[PDB]
Amino acid sequence: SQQFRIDSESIRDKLNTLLPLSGSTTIIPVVDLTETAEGGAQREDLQKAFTLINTIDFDVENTTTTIANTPGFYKVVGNLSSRDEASGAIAVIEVTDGITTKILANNRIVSPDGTTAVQSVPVPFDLMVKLVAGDTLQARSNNAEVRVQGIARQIADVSGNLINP
Amino acid sequence: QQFRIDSESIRDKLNTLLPSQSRLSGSTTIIPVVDLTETAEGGAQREDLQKAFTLINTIDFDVENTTTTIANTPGFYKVVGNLSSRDEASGAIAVIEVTDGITTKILANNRIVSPDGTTAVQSVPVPFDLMVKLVAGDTLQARSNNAEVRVQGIARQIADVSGNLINP
Amino acid sequence: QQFRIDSESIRDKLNTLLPSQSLSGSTTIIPVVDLTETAEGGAQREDLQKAFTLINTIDFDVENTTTTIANTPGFYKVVGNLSSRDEASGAIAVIEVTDGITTKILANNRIVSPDGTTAVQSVPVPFDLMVKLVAGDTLQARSNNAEVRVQGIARQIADVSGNLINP
Amino acid sequence: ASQQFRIDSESIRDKLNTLLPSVDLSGSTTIIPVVDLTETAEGGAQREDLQKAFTLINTIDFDVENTTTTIANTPGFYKVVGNLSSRDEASGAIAVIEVTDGITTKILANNRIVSPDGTTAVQSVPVPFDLMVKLVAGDTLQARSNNAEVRVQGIARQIADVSGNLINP
Amino acid sequence: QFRIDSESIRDKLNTLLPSQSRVDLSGSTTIIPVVDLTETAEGGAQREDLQKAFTLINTIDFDVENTTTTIANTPGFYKVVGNLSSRDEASGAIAVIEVTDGITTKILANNRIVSPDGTTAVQSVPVPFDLMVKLVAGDTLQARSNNAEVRVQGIARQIADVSGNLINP
Ligand code: NA
Ligand code: NA
Ligand code: NA
Ligand code: NA
Numbered sequence: 072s073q074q075f076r077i078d079s080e081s082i083r084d085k086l087n088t089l090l091p092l093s094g095s096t097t098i099i100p101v102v103d104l105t106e107t108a109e110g111g112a113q114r115e116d117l118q119k120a121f122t123l124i125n126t127i128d129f130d131v132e133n134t135t136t137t138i139a140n141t142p143g144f145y146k147v148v149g150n151l152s153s154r155d156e157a158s159g160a161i162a163v164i165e166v167t168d169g170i171t172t173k174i175l176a177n178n179r180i181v182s183p184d185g186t187t188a189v190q191s192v193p194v195p196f197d198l199m200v201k202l203v204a205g206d207t208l209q210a211r212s213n214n215a216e217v218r219v220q221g222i223a224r225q226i227a228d229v230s231g232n233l234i235n236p
Numbered sequence: 237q238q239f240r241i242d243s244e245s246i247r248d249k250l251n252t253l254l255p256s257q258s259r260l261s262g263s264t265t266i267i268p269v270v271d272l273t274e275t276a277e278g279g280a281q282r283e284d285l286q287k288a289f290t291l292i293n294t295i296d297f298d299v300e301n302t303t304t305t306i307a308n309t310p311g312f313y314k315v316v317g318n319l320s321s322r323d324e325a326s327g328a329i330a331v332i333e334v335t336d337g338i339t340t341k342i343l344a345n346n347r348i349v350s351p352d353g354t355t356a357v358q359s360v361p362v363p364f365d366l367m368v369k370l371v372a373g374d375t376l377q378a379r380s381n382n383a384e385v386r387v388q389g390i391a392r393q394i395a396d397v398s399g400n401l402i403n404p
Numbered sequence: 405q406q407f408r409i410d411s412e413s414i415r416d417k418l419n420t421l422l423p424s425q426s427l428s429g430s431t432t433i434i435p436v437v438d439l440t441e442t443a444e445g446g447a448q449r450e451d452l453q454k455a456f457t458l459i460n461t462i463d464f465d466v467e468n469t470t471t472t473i474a475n476t477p478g479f480y481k482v483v484g485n486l487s488s489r490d491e492a493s494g495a496i497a498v499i500e501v502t503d504g505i506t507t508k509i510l511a512n513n514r515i516v517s518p519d520g521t522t523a524v525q526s527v528p529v530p531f532d533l534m535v536k537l538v539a540g541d542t543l544q545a546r547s548n549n550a551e552v553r554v555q556g557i558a559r560q561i562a563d564v565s566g567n568l569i570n571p
Numbered sequence: 572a573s574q575q576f577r578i579d580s581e582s583i584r585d586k587l588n589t590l591l592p593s594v595d596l597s598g599s600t601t602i603i604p605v606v607d608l609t610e611t612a613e614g615g616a617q618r619e620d621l622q623k624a625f626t627l628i629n630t631i632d633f634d635v636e637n638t639t640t641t642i643a644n645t646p647g648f649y650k651v652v653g654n655l656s657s658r659d660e661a662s663g664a665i666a667v668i669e670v671t672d673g674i675t676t677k678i679l680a681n682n683r684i685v686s687p688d689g690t691t692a693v694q695s696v697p698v699p700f701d702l703m704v705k706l707v708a709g710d711t712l713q714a715r716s717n718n719a720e721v722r723v724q725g726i727a728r729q730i731a732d733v734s735g736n737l738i739n740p
Numbered sequence: 741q742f743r744i745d746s747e748s749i750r751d752k753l754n755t756l757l758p759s760q761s762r763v764d765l766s767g768s769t770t771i772i773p774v775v776d777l778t779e780t781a782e783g784g785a786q787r788e789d790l791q792k793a794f795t796l797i798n799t800i801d802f803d804v805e806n807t808t809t810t811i812a813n814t815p816g817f818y819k820v821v822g823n824l825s826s827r828d829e830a831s832g833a834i835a836v837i838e839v840t841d842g843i844t845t846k847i848l849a850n851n852r853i854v855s856p857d858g859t860t861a862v863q864s865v866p867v868p869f870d871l872m873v874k875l876v877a878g879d880t881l882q883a884r885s886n887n888a889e890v891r892v893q894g895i896a897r898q899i900a901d902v903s904g905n906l907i908n909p
Contacts, residue, residue: 072572072599074265077591082266085780086435089612090241090262094591097575098439098583098598100753103273104771105607107417108253115618116283117312117399120369121343123334128341132324144621144740150362152324152350153697156636156656156722160350166627173632175625177724182656182664184720186692188354193321193362194654194697201624201740216352218324220345227621236369241433249611250773254429257408262433266777268587271440272602275752276421279566280536284450285479288536289510291501296508300491318529320491320517328517356521358694361488361529384519386491388512404536406770414771418604422744422767429771433608438778442586443756447904449788452817455874456848458839463846467829485867487829487855495855523859525694528826528867551857553829555850565748571874573766576759583757590781598757601766602744609776619787648790657866660805660825660891670796677801679794681893686825686833688889690861698823698866705793705909735786 072097113233119146119226120236127223131162131210138164140207142229145200147208149221150193151178162217164196168205175200178217196221203229237264278403287314287394288404295391299330299378306332308375310397313368315376317389318361319346328382332364336373343368346385364389371397405431445570454481454561455571462558466497466545471554473499475542477564480535482543484556485528486513495549499531503540510535513552531556538564573601617737623650623730624740631727635666635714640723642668644711646733649704651712653725654697655682666721668700672709679704682721700725707733742767786908792819792899793909800896804835804883809892811837813880815902818873820881822894823866824851835890837869841878848873851890869894876902 077092086092106112127138129149139145151162156179164176176196183189200208210219227233241247241260250260274281280288297304297317307313319330324347332344344364351357368376378387395401406428409415415427441448462473464484474480486497491514499511511531518524535543545554562568578584578596587594610616631642633653643649655666660683668680680700687693704712714723731737744750744765754762779785800811802822812818824835829852837849849869856862873881883892900906 072575072597075591075594077266077593079592079781082591082777082780085777086262086264086775089435089609089775089777090239090246090433091243093237093265094587095265095267096594096597098268098270098578098596098757100272100599100602100756101269101605102276102418102421102602103271103607104414104417104421104604105253107414108411108606111399114283114399114401115620116287116367117369117395119620120312120367121334122369122371123336123339123341123374126334126341126343128343130342130345144624150345150348152348154350155352156720158352162350166625166630168627171627173627173630173726174634174724175630175632175726177634177654180654180656180697180722180724181695182658182666182721183695184659184662184664184693185690186353186694188356188692189352190354190358190694191349191351192360192696193348195363195699199620199624201621201626203626203628206627216324217350218348220348222341222343231617231621233618238432243612246433246608246611249608250429250431250606253606253608253773254407254409254414254771255411256429257410260431260433262775263435266435266437266591267774268439268590269436269605269774270443270753270756271438272749272752272756273421274566275749276602276746279748280479280562281566282450284454284534285536285562285566288479288534289501290536290538291503291506291508291541294501294508294510296510298509298512318512318515320515322517323519326519328519354520356523357519358521358525359516359518360527361515363530384491385517386515388515390508390510409771418767418769421604422602422742422749423746424742424767425745426742427769427771430773433773433775435777436774437587437590437781438776439583439586439590440756442583443580446582447817447900449904451788451792451819451872452874452900452904455817455872456839457874457876458841458844458846458879461839461846461848463848465847465850485850485853487853489855490857493857495857521858523861524857525859525863526854526856527865528853530868551829552855553853555853557846557848567752574763576757576763577761578757579760580758590778598753598759600763601768602749603768604771605774606771607776608773612775619789623789648793660889670794670799672796675796677796677799677895678803678893679799679801679895681803681823684823684825684866684891684893685864686827686835686890687864688828688831688862689859690863692861694863696865699868703789703793705790705795707795707797710796731790735790737787 122236125224131212131219133215135211138208138223143225144227147198147223152217153191153194155189160214160217162212162219167207290404293392297378299380299387301383303379306376306391311393312395315391316365320385321359321362328385330380330385330387335375457571460559464545466547466554468550470546473543473558478560479562481561482558483532487552488526488529495552497547497552497554501543629728633714635716635723637719639715642712642727647729648731650730651727652701656721657695657698658683659693664718664721666716666723798897804885804892806888808884811881811896816898817900819899820896821870825890826864826867827852828862833887833890835885835892
């Protein structure tokens with residue numbers, strides 16, 4: 072095990088801010104105990120799991136229903152009833168503050184040709200939405216013939232702290 | 237080499253990471269390493285590998301006009317598959333739901349299509365791909381209320397209720 | 405210097421990680437560079453490591469037969485489509501795993517439920533699976549009818565012990 | 572010291588030389604347990620799924636019919652997700668996502684894809700897209716529909732500046 | 741400070757660190773805190789989603805009808821995403837993504853997949869693909885349509901060189 076001097080200001084700069092140069096010729100095999108030392112891993116797929124208690128289930132027809140309206144990060148997944156882009160029947164996921172509204176998932180998308188018999192399919196969505204104070208995430212159907220369906224849960228608080236399942 | 241470290245941040249972390257049985261500096265020599273952690277843990281720790289389906293671990297289901305339990309013991313479960321789409325006004329229901337016998341929540345729903353100008357309603361698969369955590373008393377199930385619709389797919393237990401990974 | 409550690413969890417993990425038929429911490433922080441990726445042959449990021457090549461690709465297009473995709477131990481990625489049929493159809497197209505005794509379907513085509521019509525339109529039914537085979541296991545594609553197909557590609561991602569196979 | 576061995580690997584030697592520019596490599600036979608303080612020392616970056624979240628303030632919402640609509644035209648990284656109205660491959664009705672500098676244009680999501688047979692009654696479905704696009708100076712990301720019958724619908728947001736610095740949600 | 745009993749670990753170390761002149765492995769009970777400088781040493785890195793972004797300059801756009809069109813034919817890792825025109829599995833109209841070396845060819849995305857029943861009016865939908873392909877010397881990634889009625893549409897870009905070195909967007 073010997074040392075050689077390094078020429079690199081970036082590494083030197085990086086190290087300085089890390090802990091307020093030379094290299095070794097011997098490669099050391101290691102095992103990393105960091106996760107165990109921290110109290111156990113928080114693998115993302117598990118942390119975001121749906122539970123009976125945490126699931127915000129929704130199935131909206133001819134009404135407007137709030138999915139969430141408290142600050143934080145939310146996963147939202149589901150489907151809309153597709154309609155002709157020329158249709159008046161709206162089934163959307165939207166966010167609003169009572170002043171403006173933005174559609175995050177839109178159903179009025181199909182463009183049939185040569186027929187008035189318009190088949191419909193689910194339009195999927197899978198979104199991560201952050202709400203601040205005064206914001207509402209909602210599902211809106213304006214017509215008895217279309218639905219907005221799915222599930223949501225709060226993934227983190229507004230400060231970005233993860234919420235256990 | 238060796239210099240002194242001033243970090244409340246690093247000091248506090250190092251002491252939480254490595255608790256002392258009893259009531260900091262840095263080196264200026266960079267050490268090249270190789271990491272054997274994954275092998276030491278038994279291999280196949282990368283998420284895609286660890287979550288793999290096997291003949292032994294696969295909970296296969298294909299549900300028509302009945303209710304079928306996928307899991308009813310605590311843990312984390314991956315569940316993937318399809319439902320038969322129907323009109324949003326149909327009586328033919330195919331769902332994935334979670335329940336404790338008191339509250340029930342649908343996680344995947346088939347009643348979604350909205351045809352116009354026709355009574356000949358075409359159907360497509362409605363996919364789902366879910367991670368569900370069950371605690372004591374919870375059931376994950378597939379349910380079809382009609383011989384004309386199915387809920388089909390596969391599931392497996394990914395981890396125990398405390399998050400410990402289950403190796404396939 | 406060094407100091408004794410009181411952590412039952414850390415002690416247990418270290419015992420498990422580095423088994424021996426036979427605990428402290430340091431206060432000096434060591435800067436490192438990690439050569440593991442190069443030592444493994446490079447291109448270890450998951451998207452690169454799992455790439456398909458002309459040589460490694462198990463291509464399949466199965467009609468009215470059973471075709472083995474893999475039958476040796478390891479982890480396999482398998483992706484593709486089935487021909488959708490009515491949920492009451494006799495025309496079956498599946499991905500399944502079997503040991504010659506038990507068989508489980510991993511992807512199923514018999515899913516659509518038309519109403520008010522006998523003219524049944526069909527779409528691809530996609531699948532994207534990670535399957536681990538052990539000794540004696542076969543992953544296969546099967547179509548029982550000339551009208552339906554199982555199409556796709558697969559490759560071996562790792563050996564049965566989890567060691568990655570580079571493309 | 573625990574027993575060491577000479578490592579014979581040009582790739583590892585060359586890599587170490589580029590990493591740590593001014594060797595005869597050796598390896599050690601003792602496995603050392605470590606804990607990593609890098610994240611603690613660095614700042615503690617936000618998990619990607621959270622960092623990329625859509626908000627009422629940050630979302631570039633679009634619903635485009637018979638017009639060309641800019642999604643972004645300043646440098647940076649943008650996530651753009653949504654759907655196009657499918658049409659027959661021989662259709663004249665175009666609904667696309669495209670990037671352009673005014674000299675050339677590339678379609679990143681194309682709607683004219685279906686190939687019906689045995690019928691002139693052509694059903695349509697959404698054609699989804701989910702893209703990460705980097706714009707440099709002079710580039711425009713846009714949604715374009717050339718006809719009242721087809722739409723481009725979706726959302727976008729700026730994920731990072733052109734230097735790769737992440738933007739908070 | 742202690743002997744390790746693990747053939748799996750010993751074999752792994754031996755593979756990682758080759759030695760022509762090739763012993764008991766050992767472990768230490770002293771946990772060492774580290775910081776990882778690798779990213780800075782490599783010149784810096786970008787998060788994967790940003791690194792893989794499409795740009796006007798890097799995008800290989802294709803819209804293929806009744807011809808064979810090369811997407812890439814030099815070594816490297818390529819992301820390729822897009823759609824094929826679906827047809828009946830019994831159709832003669834082919835739209836595929838394939839890889840070839842001029843002797844062997846394999847289809848990576850296939851359009852002839854639908855199985856209508858009780859009708860000769862066969863509706864078509866996009867068949868999506870999203871692939872990572874590694875080409876070595878002599879390999880070609882291509883889109884092929886054998887009929888004017890079917891298309892292969894999409895975008896691709898080179899993600900890394902053949903050794904895995906990442907290409908900046
Ligand atoms: Na209704
Ligand atoms: Na039935
Ligand atoms: Na056939
Ligand atoms: Na219109």
